[PDB]
Symmetry: C3
Subunit: 336 residues, 3 copies
Amino acid sequence: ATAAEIAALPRQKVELVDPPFVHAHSQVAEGGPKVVEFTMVIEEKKIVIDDAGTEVHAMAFNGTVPGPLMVVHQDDYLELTLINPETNTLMHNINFHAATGALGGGGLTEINPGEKTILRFKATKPGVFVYHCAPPGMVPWHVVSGMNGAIMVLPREGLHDGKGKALTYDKIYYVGEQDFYVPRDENGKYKKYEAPGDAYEDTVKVMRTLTPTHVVFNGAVGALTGDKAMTAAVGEKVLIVHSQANRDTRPHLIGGHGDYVWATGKFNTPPDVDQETWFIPGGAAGAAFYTFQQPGIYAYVNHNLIEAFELGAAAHFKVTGEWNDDLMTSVLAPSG
Amino acid sequence: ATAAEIAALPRQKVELVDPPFVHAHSQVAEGGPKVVEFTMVIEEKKIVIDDAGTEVHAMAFNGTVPGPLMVVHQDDYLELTLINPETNTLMHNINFHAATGALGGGGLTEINPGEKTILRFKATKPGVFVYHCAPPGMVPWHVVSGMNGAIMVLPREGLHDGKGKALTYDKIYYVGEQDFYVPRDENGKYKKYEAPGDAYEDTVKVMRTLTPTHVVFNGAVGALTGDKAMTAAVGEKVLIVHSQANRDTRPHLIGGHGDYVWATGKFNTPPDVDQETWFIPGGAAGAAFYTFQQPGIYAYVNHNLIEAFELGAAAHFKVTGEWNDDLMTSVLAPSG
Amino acid sequence: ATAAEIAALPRQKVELVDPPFVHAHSQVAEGGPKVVEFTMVIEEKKIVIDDAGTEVHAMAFNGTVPGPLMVVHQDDYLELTLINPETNTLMHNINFHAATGALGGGGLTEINPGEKTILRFKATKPGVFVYHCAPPGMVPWHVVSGMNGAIMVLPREGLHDGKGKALTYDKIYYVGEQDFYVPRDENGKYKKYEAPGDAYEDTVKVMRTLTPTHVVFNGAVGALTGDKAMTAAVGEKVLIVHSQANRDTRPHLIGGHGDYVWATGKFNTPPDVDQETWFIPGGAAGAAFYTFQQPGIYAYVNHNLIEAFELGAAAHFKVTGEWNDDLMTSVLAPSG
Ligand SMILES: O=N[O-]
Ligand SMILES: O=N[O-]
Ligand SMILES: O=N[O-]
Ligand SMILES: [Cu+2]
Ligand SMILES: [Cu+2]
Ligand SMILES: [Cu+2]
Ligand SMILES: [Cu+2]
Ligand SMILES: [Cu+2]
Ligand SMILES: [Cu+2]
């Protein structure tokens, strides 16, 4: 398309919402290609990632870890206004794995505190994709400080299974998984720092062990539990988008399955089916579609169980509805 | 199905056999859906896992690590009587990744020493699936103590390749891979404990490093080598089911291939073909089908070769038959 | 083929070139099956892997890490003359994951310094496959000392997408990824040695931590950058073959994608498409096909960003051509 044709396309400003929720959208595209506008302010902020009070100097797109999910359709243009407030101390940029050119956009979005930039790219490929900050020379440090999220580029005709049958979800959740590398003192207690820069050297030493101290969903151990647990109902169709910008993960819905899983996150690649545990490599997003069949509590985890239950990678689903004894039943309850 | 229809289904008790062998079964289903009954007694016992007398307080379904492979067909029901003898000291349960509801069955089978339970679930999805104990609050500890196994839910019409052609194996083996985390004292010697609970704190410390001290097949270094090597003959079709309940693995048959590999373990997902090394994420089982073409010794390993030859993840196959010079030949033997 | 039929086949002597380049070949087979001859001399030599002067005692096929890429077509025979100079100190052999029998050839090619051997095998399966040395009892040590490479067995009809449409590349590059485990002294300084065997004990201790000190392409940090950056032009189709003989990797072309990716490396397994980051398990090779659409510098990395930017797993592509503002444009450049 020419500059004139792009200038003529309708524009729609979208208000982002915080993970695990996703801003309102249509699965099947409304009309022809549009320039979808988003705005995100970067916030360097202290966040607590566990019940003990462990602190991390997060680098957060839109103030959250992960950054919010942006949703557009194939061949729409995503136009992002990215702002780096003067209150921040580091330069930041953004790299969309969904985009083509200039390192995903990082080469055109390096902004120092007090600057902003507007990047536009054509979403040519359908699927869920990671986005993350990547300043040359300090790439992993920003990413493992939480400066990453994902976007979803829906086919214009919505989702379909491998044989062309439509798959329409009732609800969608975005689970961003974060590996953190928090320095510890001689007592084995996590350290706290005044400014992000103070923690650099100590953090890089932990990073080099390739062993995170915490592996969490939505920025903290237990973030998606209790009143923040995800919800569904028997018969409800749920799409769970999951991303990990730096390290591998293996999602598993305890008590359920991934009925259709685009493990690579790309919609033109037919989904695997009937999955117990799927795999998303570091640097990618994946998506699983499931129709709940049993009520009760479910745990959604990274199935390296040490990472799930010792390091923090566990979320819960609260599901309403009638129990199905055909599917499962306790013939003899625990007894002598 | 109605309530009467379920109650009318035939019940059949099956005798289990220890891994890597598999109990008697038919690839194509015999008769209509059935309630297949299995019974497993849980044994907490000390086992030696290496050539240095290193001990692990194993938590073993049916007394073996891994627990035995249970085989049923799609839409059969699996009805398991699980027994936890009064001589054990810990509460246990079972979670079938093949099952739907109550955390895979874990929520309905929590049995203390001196108790038993019977769980029934409908095997609605075909494939090989992991099963493992998962007591709330102590999930990875039980799993990495060897309390895991797998089941196979065969399609009622048996296995097929991506084009619908039948794949009938002559024999099947179940290789359960286990990551162990054995504590060491300041001198580097593995520690021994009187009771399982005594090792809990020390073991979790090792678990959190995400670095196993041992990675083994059938519960010990060398368990499937030498006189315990698996066997085959040139021309024989072999299915190798592999599971890892907590950590990733990458099986490889040294000297052969995976002709058809259901890497995700689900039969409704077309198998990959001509595989050199396949990948099974922690929390899943996979299956590989291979027709042997050359006699001799083969090594079957986790292809992170440090895990295989330093940590213990290596098995052998002894194959009989005639050598095929067309496939391979020494044109010039090692010489000056 | 009978011995006579094979003897009547034409022979072609190939000249190998150093990675990341690939020797001359035709994508579509020229004529019928042939016996393709290759010769490689094993070189035990010191290589410097980082800018701190860190040394590794490399065990290099053809004098390079990785060893060179060998290209043949399905059902051709690969006849390798392997030489172990008397100037070397250890016994070596070769195992082709592409071959069938004798542990992939290792059982028929064990050569001490001063010996040579000639192995012939039929390339029955199409795809890219790892090859590596594997001396019984010292397997991982030789592999992580750089003694590994890959071969590509092209379909006789060249490459095709999932629907059978031809995929023809303009350029091809071979990236061999290597995990190194270099011993450190009590001051954190990397140790140096005057003989390969002198480093065995120390290296094994590091290998057992499953934590490499370096993860690099083509044997060294920054190897494939600057004077060795790979090149292309907008509109050019490029195949990137990637191998890792011992440990998992997750390739990603920063600023681009894997339009078609044979993640398992096997051409009869349909390729995934529109990939952001693909996954290659330790012990395998994979291949990605991409058509460049934007000029500029691209970074090709293992997307665990710590491995890429702290440990050494990053390469560059320098692409010429016109910028495409439809695909991406800076609406507002970084500004106050
Ligand atoms: O099914 N989760 O251990
Ligand atoms: O070729 N197996 O190390
Ligand atoms: O987009 N790769 O950092
Ligand atoms: Cu940043
Ligand atoms: Cu990236
Ligand atoms: Cu248990
Ligand atoms: Cu599980
Ligand atoms: Cu060697
Ligand atoms: Cu190998």
